[PDB]
Short mmCIF file of C-alpha atoms in Angstrom, two decimals:
data_model
loop_
_atom_site.label_atom_id
_atom_site.label_comp_id
_atom_site.label_asym_id
_atom_site.label_seq_id
_atom_site.Cartn_x
_atom_site.Cartn_y
_atom_site.Cartn_z
CA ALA A 1 -12.12 -14.32 3.97
CA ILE A 2 -8.38 -14.43 3.28
CA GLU A 3 -6.08 -13.12 6.00
CA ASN A 4 -3.08 -11.66 4.14
CA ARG A 5 -0.96 -8.53 3.60
CA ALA A 6 -3.18 -7.18 0.82
CA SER A 7 -6.25 -7.30 3.06
CA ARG A 8 -4.42 -5.66 5.99
CA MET A 9 -3.19 -2.85 3.77
CA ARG A 10 -6.67 -2.31 2.32
CA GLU A 11 -8.29 -2.30 5.77
CA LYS A 12 -5.73 0.13 7.20
CA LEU A 13 -5.70 2.53 4.24
CA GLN A 14 -9.47 2.53 3.76
CA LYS A 15 -9.99 3.10 7.49
CA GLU A 16 -7.44 5.91 7.88
CA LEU A 17 -7.87 7.85 4.62
CA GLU A 18 -11.42 6.89 3.56
CA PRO A 19 -10.31 6.95 -0.07
CA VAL A 20 -12.86 7.28 -2.83
CA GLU A 21 -10.46 5.13 -4.84
CA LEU A 22 -8.09 2.44 -3.57
CA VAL A 23 -6.03 0.16 -5.80
CA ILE A 24 -3.72 -2.37 -4.15
CA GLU A 25 -1.84 -4.33 -6.81
CA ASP A 26 0.39 -7.27 -5.91
CA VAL A 27 3.25 -7.56 -8.40
CA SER A 28 5.49 -9.74 -6.21
CA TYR A 29 5.37 -12.58 -8.77
CA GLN A 30 7.61 -10.51 -11.07
CA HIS A 31 10.17 -9.50 -8.46
CA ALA A 32 10.30 -12.13 -5.72
CA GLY A 33 9.67 -15.66 -4.51
CA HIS A 34 10.94 -19.04 -5.68
CA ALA A 35 9.52 -22.56 -5.94
CA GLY A 36 12.19 -23.76 -3.51
CA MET A 37 10.77 -21.48 -0.82
CA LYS A 38 7.06 -21.62 -1.69
CA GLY A 39 4.59 -22.13 1.15
CA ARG A 40 7.21 -21.24 3.76
CA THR A 41 8.17 -17.64 2.95
CA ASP A 42 6.15 -14.42 2.75
CA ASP A 43 5.37 -13.92 -0.96
CA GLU A 44 3.70 -10.52 -0.52
CA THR A 45 6.75 -8.35 -1.11
CA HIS A 46 5.97 -5.89 -3.93
CA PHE A 47 2.95 -3.59 -4.13
CA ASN A 48 1.68 -0.71 -6.26
CA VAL A 49 -0.83 1.37 -4.32
CA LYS A 50 -3.04 4.13 -5.68
CA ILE A 51 -5.00 6.14 -3.13
CA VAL A 52 -7.53 8.82 -4.06
CA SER A 53 -8.68 10.55 -0.87
CA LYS A 54 -9.66 14.05 0.33
CA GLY A 55 -7.27 13.73 3.28
CA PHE A 56 -4.42 14.67 0.93
CA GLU A 57 -5.77 18.20 0.38
CA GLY A 58 -3.15 20.84 1.16
CA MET A 59 -0.42 18.23 1.48
CA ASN A 60 2.68 18.37 -0.68
CA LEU A 61 3.82 15.03 -2.13
CA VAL A 62 6.42 14.38 0.58
CA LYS A 63 3.84 14.67 3.37
CA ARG A 64 1.29 12.45 1.60
CA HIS A 65 3.87 9.75 0.98
CA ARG A 66 5.26 10.02 4.52
CA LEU A 67 1.71 9.59 5.80
CA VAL A 68 1.14 6.48 3.68
CA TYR A 69 4.55 5.03 4.64
CA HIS A 70 3.74 5.70 8.29
CA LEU A 71 0.44 3.85 7.97
CA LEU A 72 2.22 0.86 6.41
CA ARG A 73 5.30 0.79 8.66
CA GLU A 74 4.35 -2.55 10.23
CA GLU A 75 4.07 -4.15 6.80
CA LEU A 76 7.44 -2.72 5.74
CA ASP A 77 8.98 -4.34 8.82
CA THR A 78 7.28 -7.70 8.26
CA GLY A 79 7.72 -8.66 4.59
CA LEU A 80 6.90 -5.68 2.37
CA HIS A 81 10.05 -4.98 0.37
CA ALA A 82 8.80 -2.49 -2.21
CA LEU A 83 5.92 -0.02 -1.98
CA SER A 84 5.15 2.24 -4.95
CA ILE A 85 2.74 5.07 -4.14
CA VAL A 86 0.39 7.29 -6.11
CA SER A 87 -1.52 9.58 -3.75
CA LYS A 88 -4.08 12.00 -5.20
CA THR A 89 -7.17 14.04 -4.35
CA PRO A 90 -10.50 13.46 -6.16
CA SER A 91 -10.07 16.87 -7.82
CA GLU A 92 -6.67 15.82 -9.15
CA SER A 93 -8.42 12.76 -10.60
CA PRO A 94 -11.26 11.85 -12.97
#
């Protein structure tokens, strides 16, 4: 019911990787924005994303991360400054 970057990222990632676990944490409030720009600039600039999906099986880290970056290329071109990624398989996780 809110059309924003977080929702787009969740939709895209969940659709493409069908993760069993998907954490999308906005930490932009620590690293960006200002009251002089508020309401007129994109404040969704910094994200920590954890994705636990079976699609990562047999992938080295570089390939997993390249995949995720590829899926979020539009966001990186339209306001997303920093994207931190943890990409695991369910076996690699609790």
